[PDB]
Design a protein around this ligand. Sequence first.
Ligand SMILES: [Mg+2]
Ligand SMILES: [Mg+2]
Ligand SMILES: [Mg+2]
Ligand SMILES: [Mg+2]
Ligand SMILES: [Mg+2]
Ligand SMILES: [Mg+2]
Ligand SMILES: [Mg+2]
Lengths: 396, 128, 202
Amino acid sequence: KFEHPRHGHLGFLPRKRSRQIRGRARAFPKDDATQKPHLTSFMVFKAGMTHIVRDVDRPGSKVNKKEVVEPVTILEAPPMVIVGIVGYRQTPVGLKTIGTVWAHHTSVEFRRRYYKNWKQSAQLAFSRQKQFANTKEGKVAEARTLNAFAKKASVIRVIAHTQLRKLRNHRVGVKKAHVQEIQINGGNVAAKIALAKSLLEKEVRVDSVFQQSEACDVCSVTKGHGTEGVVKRWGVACLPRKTHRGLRKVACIGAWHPARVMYTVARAGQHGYHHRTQLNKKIYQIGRSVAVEPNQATTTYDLTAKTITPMGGFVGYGTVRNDYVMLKGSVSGPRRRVMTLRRPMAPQTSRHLKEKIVLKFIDTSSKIGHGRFQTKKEKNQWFGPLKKDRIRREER
Amino acid sequence: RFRVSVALPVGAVVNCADNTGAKNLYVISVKGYHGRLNRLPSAALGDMVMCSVKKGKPELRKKVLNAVIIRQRKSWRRKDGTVIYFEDNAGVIVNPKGEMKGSGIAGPVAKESADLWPKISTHAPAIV
Amino acid sequence: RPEIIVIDLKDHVLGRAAAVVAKQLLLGKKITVVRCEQLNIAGTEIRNKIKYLQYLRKRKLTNPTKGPFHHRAPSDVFVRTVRSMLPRYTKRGMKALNSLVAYEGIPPNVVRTGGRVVIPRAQRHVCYRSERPYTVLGNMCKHVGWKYSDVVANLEKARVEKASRHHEKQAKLREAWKAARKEALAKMPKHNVEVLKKFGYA
RNA sequence: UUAGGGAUAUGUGGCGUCAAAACUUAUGGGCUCAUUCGAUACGUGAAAAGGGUGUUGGUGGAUAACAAAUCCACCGGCCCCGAAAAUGGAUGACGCU
RNA sequence: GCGACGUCGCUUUUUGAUCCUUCGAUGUCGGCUCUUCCUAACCUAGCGCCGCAGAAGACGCUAAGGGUUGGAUUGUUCACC
RNA sequence: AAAGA
RNA sequence: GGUAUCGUGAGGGAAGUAUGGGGUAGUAAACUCCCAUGCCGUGCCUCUAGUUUCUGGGGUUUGUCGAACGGCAAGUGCCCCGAAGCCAUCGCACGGUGGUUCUCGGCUGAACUCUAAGCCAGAAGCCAAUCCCAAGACCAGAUGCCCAC
Ligand SMILES: [Mg+2]
Ligand SMILES: [Mg+2]
Ligand SMILES: [Mg+2]
Ligand SMILES: [Mg+2]
Ligand SMILES: [Mg+2]
Ligand SMILES: [Mg+2]
Ligand SMILES: [Mg+2]
């Protein structure tokens, strides 16, 4: 008889706190040995959002026509320092690591990750591996396992961490290094270590991994809300105003049989702070740093000079100082939470996902307000030498 | 069709911006709506609805008839990124197939209702 | 220190073999099982796929992560057929179960653990072969899950050939005996050649 | 059909594992493949006609030609469909062919 | 596509029985809310087939996977628009 | 797991 | 042994689904696609909207501090506006994958036709996979660091 479509999605149970804030790709793309060895993932930090105006393509009705305002997300992406190389056997109980070569140097932020205090400690992390690397048996026991990553290995995963001393953001209160294994999806695993062995202990910047107009998948950890009730966690319904013992509940959570509450009925508990993936988030610009190009947000039709950082920074994040990546739309983070990009799974051959992009406008109007001004040198033009600077720029 | 925000649930009294005699357009049900549970059928800016006139001439009153929304007092975000809306709800009263039926509209018909009804725009003083 | 009777299960019917292994585990012996892939079952594959998709259909309605946990990977389907042929809710029967290992193929730690063993009273071919449809268990479990059929079909290929590298190398070490043991006659006391001949060991 | 014990032997029921017993009998005669086979009485009854161009059995009646053998009609099932429900699911379980 | 005549299997949200459980209490229909399940398939989905030229219907099978509304009167279930 | 065998 | 990091992933969960359009084409009608919308799902807060105990800034009302200034009392006086945060099918982003088989069109022909053996083929379907959880599946996964006795 009467019914409705079921509330919430059973394929995101249990609604549980993710085991770490670090967004972590559960699966990397299928290894097409017909490609070149490359890096298929990258960790960025969610700065915040803004929106942009685009010259549209893909002839439809709202397309092949005047521009469009589409909301975007700014993800600050400093270059990642590769430290290790990790290979896996394809054994009948699923992949298993067959060793891990490290670099000879290992940044002081990486070694913090193997601690939880690091300032009362004695900093012995990787002490007998720096020493033993300078040995000869070290070089033996290192090429003995690199000559293994070709015999036994199929999956080769460098270990990259983030540069945070290169991320002058303070509101990212952490000084450890976020450590992430990254798949290499080239071919001829012999030539797959060759990449890994090469870029080891070298910085990997995000445009080396990704290109501008193509889409990624964003492994991330949702913004947490603590214990949310049934109406907020599952979005079931509110009982009528007349209800006793209140109305933000599921009335019937079980028949007489089965005489147990089902895993399908809605209950209150952890909402948010879940690991999500957000397939097919399309990059619109992968612009470089202000230290190298202090004209981030001025493409061709905003011949003024400006940067991505809005007037007064991104709210609750700061200024973007590094190789930001501009996606399209939502990303399952709060500000300054590490996001992991990933090259996508989908066939991606479409006139709605493989089309190239030019951005005719970006908004740097302040997040903190309403903002009516781009590029604060426009605000000074609206006003005059008002009494704040008048009491300083006329008192000399 | 468009991504117009919905403004006029079933049972809304829209007024008639069409010189056919009527004054109100008590929304009977939205033509084209696919039912959902406990969800009131909500008209939008371009939607064609079925109406009964609650005020105006009697030659069209006690009768179910059609209507196309002209104006929407609820702000819908245009896809060009411009959130726009009207002083007042408004709807032409229309042929069951869809045709103008009534003296050219006394109001600024919106873009989302003209390019879904080639017979309305040709009677509307302004388009906005 | 221990003594394991490393059994083999190529062309052993899944049930005439789990009944024999169960009773031996239950007689205190410590059986390790290999090549559960090649276990056979009577009937066509479709019939055996439905006799198992009807079991993959049973789960605790209210909480599946408590329901009957179905296993792909014949290595434990053979363990599953044994656990069911066994007194599970005694410590006697949980010890008997924990004496199997039931690998897949011949892992490297049991290729060099001595010669291995088969159960003739379960080999599907005590007689002529008529035409009847049997199903390799590794080929029925590929079709209900068990992503790792490719994996073990290559691990066991890099072995059935790497062993064949060692049957023909060290082949010229074998006849260094069956000839030395052959000409180990007619130089030695006829005193003993006669009783080797008597009891056939000649 | 019943005092407390031991032994010998049976009853009903059984002897692949659970489970003692054919460590899967040197078993013998046929039957059976069943995309829910079938398998301990009484549990309640499992499946009713119906047919076939199906697998095995039997009787009436031709040709010496079917498209050196090949027929016209039926009796008999094992077995195919006829036949279906609602927590997941039961020969008791696995499993057996 | 069914209809004479008819019959024969299986049917419960069935009409009643039965008095087996409950009389030192299994709290009464309907809703609300929410979850599940089945197919005897309403929709979409797959061919099939006709006096199925297009159109458009027509019969049928396979599939429980997804979907199956908003109101007026009624306490209603049902019924009706 | 080794590697030798 | 401890502690720490990175993984593995057995197993369980599982979801995307409708509708219109353009298109070639009034064609001995649909079909890779192109285009939206709707629902569902998961997110998000750039915008729009709501929200205000930033009681932020202002205004005002009775009382009240001798009066302004400044406040205060009216369990937040009332009011206009209001960032931040939260949040809306009120805003926004995203959710188009490989095998396997049966219906089935059919192949070879035996004892001429699809099947008695030999066989392609494919909609759902199931099955993994993407996805969510994660060794009480006790990981002889890899790895960092280290004692006393
Ligand atoms: Mg009350
Ligand atoms: Mg005795
Ligand atoms: Mg016999
Ligand atoms: Mg009730
Ligand atoms: Mg009502
Ligand atoms: Mg898994
Ligand atoms: Mg699984």
